[PDB]
């Protein structure tokens, strides 16, 4: 039931990274790494 207008989210072992990461819900049919899942570049607070 629509207890969640928000799209579901969970913390699950990301077996690739071997790290607990977010899991945003999404339809089960579809390419899971599209050119929309690119993150905009950013300079980290590390480095000179």
């Amino acid at each position: 039931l629509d207890a969640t207008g928000r799209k579901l989210q969970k913390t699950m072992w990301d077996p690739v990274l071997q790290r607990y990461t977010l899991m945003k819900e999404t339809k089960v049919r579809g390419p899971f790494l599209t050119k929309s899942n690119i993150a905009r570049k950013v300079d980290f607070p590390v480095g000179a």
Binding site: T11, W13, P15, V16, Q18, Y20
Partner: protein, 168 residues
Amino acid sequence: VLNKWAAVTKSAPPAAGLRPLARTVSPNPKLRPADYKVPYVLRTFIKDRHSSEMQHIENRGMYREELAIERSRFPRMQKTLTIQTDGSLNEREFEFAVPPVVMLFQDRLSAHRQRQVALAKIGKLKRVKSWETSVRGKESLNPVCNALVFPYCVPKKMLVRPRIVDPL
């Protein structure tokens, strides 16, 4: 479970020492215990889980570097001056938004000074007197005992006498 010889095997599963499994009641009404009643504890939602899960323990007995003041029970008490009807200035505290000094009517003495003058209507103000109470209405029976001292009563052969009647 996948072993070493499987056609496909997986990377490192997570050591359980991090992100642990809370042992909490299953939502299934068959897999919850008997005494369990739905927790309608109405509470202001504490956001950060550091201060959330803390509620689920009862550590009022654990040693504390602080002093053992009875905390989180007395809400927040605002002192304000209360000038009693005879000007005797007390000072008491309340939890809601009380103003500073509150003028007071209907005090203890005023009530007593009310009952007297109202008892002055029936004129019985003055007093009822014991030594002058040669009224000797009584009776002695065997299995009888006072009732006002119920926790520390004692049964014996006790004289019975009626109470005083005060019209008010």
